[PDB]
Amino acid sequence: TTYADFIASGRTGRRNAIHD
Amino acid sequence: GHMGNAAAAKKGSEQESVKEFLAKAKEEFLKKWESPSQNTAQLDHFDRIKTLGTGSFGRVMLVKHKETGNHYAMKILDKQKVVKLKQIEHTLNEKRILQAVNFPFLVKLEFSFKDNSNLYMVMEYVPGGEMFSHLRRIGRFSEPHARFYAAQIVLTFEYLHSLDLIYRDLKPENLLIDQQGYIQVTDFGFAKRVKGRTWTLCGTPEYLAPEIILSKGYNKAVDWWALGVLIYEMAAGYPPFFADQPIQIYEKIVSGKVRFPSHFSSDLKDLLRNLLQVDLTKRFGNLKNGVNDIKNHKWFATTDWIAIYQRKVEAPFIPKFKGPGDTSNFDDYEEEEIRVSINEKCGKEFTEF
Ligand SMILES: Cc1cncc2cccc(S(=O)(=O)N3CCCNCC3)c12
Known part of the structure; x- marks a missing residue:
């Protein structure tokens, strides 16, 4: 499912801006 | 129609x-x-309570203003670190915008000041996380x-x-x-x-x-x-x-x-x-x-x-919300001292702050 794909992305936590 | x-x-x-x-x-x-306004308080006007957020910018702490008893969120930036990370213009710009805007959904900057080592922006504490x-x-x-x-x-x-x-x-x-x-x-x-x-x-x-x-x-x-x-x-x-x-x-x-x-x-x-x-x-x-x-x-x-x-x-x-100073809707962070060097750092760069 799309939700499972989101979990699999590894990007479920707080996201950094490009400069960080 | x-x-x-x-x-x-x-x-x-x-x-x-x-x-x-x-x-x-x-x-x-x-x-x-x-x-723009400037130098509207100093560090010893506040008790530091707890770190509420961290980042490459530094940290945000819950503080209590000694005279009024009001809680605030104090963003603390290390001037030498801001320089190293090439964030001088952004940091000055953030403070200038914050002191000039006024809208019910934009956080209010209540005080700002600096010392030998750090820059400080004291904003209303937003307790909901x-x-x-x-x-x-x-x-x-x-x-x-x-x-x-x-x-x-x-x-x-x-x-x-x-x-x-x-x-x-x-x-x-x-x-x-x-x-x-x-x-x-x-x-x-x-x-x-x-x-x-x-x-x-x-x-x-x-x-x-x-x-x-x-x-x-x-x-x-x-x-x-x-x-x-x-x-x-x-x-x-x-x-x-x-x-x-x-x-x-x-x-x-x-x-x-x-x-x-x-x-x-x-x-x-x-x-x-x-x-x-x-x-x-x-x-x-x-x-x-x-x-x-x-x-x-x-x-x-x-x-x-x-x-x-x-x-x-x-x-x-x-x-x-259990009362003023409730921090339960933010994460926990390791508490680090805030050090103030005996020598001014990066004075020229931050003259306008
Ligand atoms: C805790 C806090 C609580 N009341 C007011 C604040 C004002 C400014 C910043 C924070 S923060 O959540 O650390 N934060 C830092 C940068 C990350 N984006 C969200 C803003 C406040």
């Missing part, structure tokens, strides 16, 4: 009143922008709940854009919830006051508009794209474009394809297709009718824009 005479007259009058409000708001902003935390915990927000927050962002961008400020830093991590359940926008380092185009690659991958990714000159329409990302993420629980690595995210963003959960209403999907529009000549918020294409969209038909502005709408969610 879609509106009868009474509704059309009421909408017309409302839109004219927005113009009148914004003209006054710009006059007020420009006075403060040209004569980051939207991010609540969204990940609840999973997703209902469409009415997402709409309540979205309306506040629409009004806030309408205000900022009237001042020629592009915001560029929208995401749930950067939106706080106050004690009444309304949104506070806090971060302004990457905002820029320009009337036309700008070119910097900045922001967070999931929220970048295609024209930023493609290294084009871009304008305030990037904020309306980002609103589409935010509304989608609030209502779905995950953003419209994600992947393991930023490069793959960028490929999806520029593709012109977006897919929706089956529970999204048709009105929501229509709004999102018009905000997440790769073609700038077609993106809502970037057309002749401006913000009105968004405010008058069917998905917002139940939104009373003035009542949101006046904060008279009952919020769908009230964060836990």
